[PDB]
Amino acid sequence: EWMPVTKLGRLVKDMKIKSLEEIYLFSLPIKESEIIDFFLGASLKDEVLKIMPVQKQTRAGQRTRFKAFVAIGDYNGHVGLGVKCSKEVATAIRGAIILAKLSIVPVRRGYWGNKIGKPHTVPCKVTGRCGSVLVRLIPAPRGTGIVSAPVPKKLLMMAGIDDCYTSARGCTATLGNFAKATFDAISKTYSYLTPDLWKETVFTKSPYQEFTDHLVKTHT
Amino acid sequence: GRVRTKTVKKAARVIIEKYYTRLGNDFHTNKRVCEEIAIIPSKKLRNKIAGYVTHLMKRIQRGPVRGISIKLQEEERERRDNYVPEVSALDQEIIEVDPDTKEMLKLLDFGSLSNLQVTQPTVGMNFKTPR
Amino acid sequence: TKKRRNNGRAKKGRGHVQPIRCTNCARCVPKDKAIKKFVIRNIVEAAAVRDISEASVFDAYVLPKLYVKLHYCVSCAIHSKVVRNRSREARKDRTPPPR
Amino acid sequence: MQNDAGEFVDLYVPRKCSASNRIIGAKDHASIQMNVAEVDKVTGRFNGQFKTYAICGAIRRMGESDDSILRLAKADGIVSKNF
Amino acid sequence: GKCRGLRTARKLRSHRRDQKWHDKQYKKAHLGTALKANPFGGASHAKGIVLEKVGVEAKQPNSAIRKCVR
């Protein structure tokens, strides 16, 4: 019973966009959860990272709402992270899955050395930065595993990063800035320009452009 | 303390847009109209809605009202909108320019263009406000 | 924390400015810190100007002025309501109040 | 980009800003990709062809995307040389 | 900042050796004053003689009587 309300949501439902790669090429702002449910559905696994209570002092006692940290992502290079504060536990956990789905980013995997098989670790030394926390991701060799704190390990496993050495800094006792600084790190593995990507970009035309005809008789 | 709430002001504006042809400047006439075209639950509300329509009828009669589209007024400010005089305002055939305006036209390669009578530039350089 | 970018005074390229005394309570205030108020209040109080001018021995006699430059400390200028407290973004505003 | 066998092991190759040669990221939502129409050399009507330029958002937040597209179109000769 | 030059090892080694004294765990393990002050004398255990049974009151909010020996 999902009716899309966006121009991008119409082309997804009408079987015109075949993967998220056609969206991530053009940096199109995802504003609907079902677009992620359409492609990556029945492959995503969720996990609640922490339910922390926050309090607002009022003139009649305290106004406690509940804040929810939800990790999402299939184990093959996509990770979201959603934060939502609500008055109820189940209300917060539901809505923070949506915000986690609207932040699915691709994770570029790379090789430590001797590029044999499938890419298994981070391509180079990246570093996230959130709050006082900076989380560095160092490329490990093959059977190393993820040598890290238990909070970003749940984020790095859900990217299909098999191998990483992790350095941390700052107050990692707050989980919010320590989950985001991890999420800021793996979301710039594509933002970094290696020598592999110096070949000039051929320009494919935009999905709002290569369906102007299918779009105008249906979405209008 | 006679301030009218939003449920009276919102209902009165939708009546006039739908039924401007029936309304006048009599309260008691529009009192009978407002019960004819509307399911108003109470009589004391009915006098307030009719009392604010008749107040608006004077403002509509003098000029336009912010939020109310009158088809007599909307379609006849279109003559203000769709207006073209018999001569354009641009075809002047003698255009007062500066020597710097003329000297750019030479670098624009239109120095052989017609007159565009130059004016003497002001010798003051008094163009800034005192601070 | 720091509340104003200058420190409530106009001392930038020097080390020490000479002090003056508050005209309301004689507190030593640096000269750039003090709330300066130049008043050109008339000496006549225009409720009384139509009595002084009808009683003059002249006909066209412009009444004189009174030129007092007042100084204030921050304590007295607030208490006299010469100045007021402002919002955090409204402190960053140096245009004087209009006339 | 590829393992030593030659298989392209990637999800996608990202675009590069055609004025700064840096990666247009996944969530760089200020990054545009505009098209400049091509006209024929005789009548000046739209023939169906176009040039594609992409400007990343940081160059766009800098306020230099104006001169950037202006320089990228003087290389194709779309803008006149005597600008 | 810090000196980085290639012959500054003495400046770096001596500044370090002076600034080691400004934390607690180095200071008490190298003065010998605290080693002089604990009654074990650098040992883990000691045998003694009970002189007296003493009652020690607990610090608040706790409100018990802690049974100790002198």
Next chain:
Amino acid sequence: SGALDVLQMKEEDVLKFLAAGTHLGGTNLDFQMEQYIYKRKSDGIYIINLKRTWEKLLLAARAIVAIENPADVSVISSRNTGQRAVLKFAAATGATPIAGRFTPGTFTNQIQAAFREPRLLVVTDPRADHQPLTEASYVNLPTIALCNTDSPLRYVDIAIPCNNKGAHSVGLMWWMLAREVLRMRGTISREHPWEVMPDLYFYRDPEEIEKEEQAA
């Protein structure tokens, strides 16, 4: 645009630009608008180079013809000197006009009523229309702007150096733009003038209206 003699300026159009006063700029100058300026006068007024503003205006026209659905181009003027020209622009070219107050979230708040997702923005003034320029940086949306000497060119992607302050010079630059859209599409021809008479687009003052109703 392109050193094609069919796309050149055709001096008929120069007398329009001098009669409206499009070559006149402000007394102060933005550093990024420096390349479009010819020379400052004696009264502080900068002179806009008309060769520069002809190339960008034709560059701006190529960006609109590259849009397939004509209503994907959205045109905004919040300042009243230009609200008439925007409506009559989209009446010809088929664009999507937003006259008056631009409500925020029009491009970002996907649940409300007026939520349209364009592919191109054309505005009148970067300082006055800063709000949709700011929101166009959230949705990958390139913007064309009419710009003066003192305009901040932040999210402007094609700037047309003009006089967007006078009423006669706002409407002319919208008129010259609409004419070059329909010529490049081939809808109207360029062997004969166009039947619109460019003072159709000019903003007329409310006291200027009623003073000629007895004259006309």
Next chain:
Amino acid sequence: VRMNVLADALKSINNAEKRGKRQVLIRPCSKVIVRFLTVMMKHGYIGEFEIIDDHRAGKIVVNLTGRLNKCGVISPRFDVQLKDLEKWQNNLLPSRQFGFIVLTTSAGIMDHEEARRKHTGGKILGFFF
């Protein structure tokens, strides 16, 4: 004062890179900089650079391709043996796949992959990636 000319050269190239500029002035030209830029240019991170002679320590205009992430110098020029070179590799370079440590060996100013081939150590100048 200015103690190190190579450091002020590489800091100015690094600042103009992230500002997105195309060209950059490098004030005083030494021959160590020129030999440093060619190693950056043979591996293709910078364009052609023009050297300007003004009858003192000249100036260099450098074309920037937009490929450089970080050109850094190492102070002091620590002597590096071939035994210790791989420990500098995983402290300076972001990956084992790209990036170079520039050495000055007796056979000239070299990147670190060439010095393994030639089997020689040297003092470290800087790095770029």
Next chain:
RNA sequence: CAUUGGAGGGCAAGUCUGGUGCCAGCAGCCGCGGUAAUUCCAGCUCCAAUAGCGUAUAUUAAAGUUGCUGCAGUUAAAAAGCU
């Protein structure tokens, strides 16, 4: 005939039952106990590592809390009054 420690949280494992009622006690740390104790004393269960396992003390990592790699020094500890 398998012990040694635990079961509020850190931290794997019970809102079980009985006693005690800021007492006796526990508790490295935050804490628990003043009459319905998820923490005491016991029974039942359960957990952990196992012929081993607690506890005290020196010490190393954790500690980018001594910082060569690698710390800070506007307001958190801190740039000498100035040359």
Next chain:
RNA sequence: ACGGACCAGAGCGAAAGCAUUUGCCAAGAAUGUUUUCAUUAAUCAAGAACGAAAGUCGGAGGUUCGAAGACGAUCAGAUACCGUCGUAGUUCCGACCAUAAACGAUGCCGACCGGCGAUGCGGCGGCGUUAUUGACCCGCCGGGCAGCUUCCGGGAAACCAAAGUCU
């Protein structure tokens, strides 16, 4: 004794600090320069000069003000606030003393990195006004004190064009 108004987010000084007129003495920055020398430099344990106020020791002087002191009030008390007197001190000359929220709570030298409008000094250029080389006007260059503005970047943030160029 003190130098008001003029007197400023203006100047000068290493900082402390510096304001009536005129004369004398020595200093100095910045600018100008197709002069000269040719690395003479940068930062600095030890050492050295300077260092408000209060205080100390000698002389001189003491108008104002005023610790201490004495009263008058207020007060439950009031050896405080407020008032009335008033020592040392405040003033100068010659020695000491070496500390201040001695603060931009921000070492110094150097490089690079956004705009914009002003300001002070020096130089240069430019329509015209005005006086018998100055005064205004429009810019340019360099050092300076600052401001506004910015998603440069940074930061725990407040905020900083430096506290930026730092995993």
Next chain:
RNA sequence: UCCAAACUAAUUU
């Protein structure tokens, strides 16, 4: 610009 000081050891959210 008159005065205006103090606040269970008796605990359980």
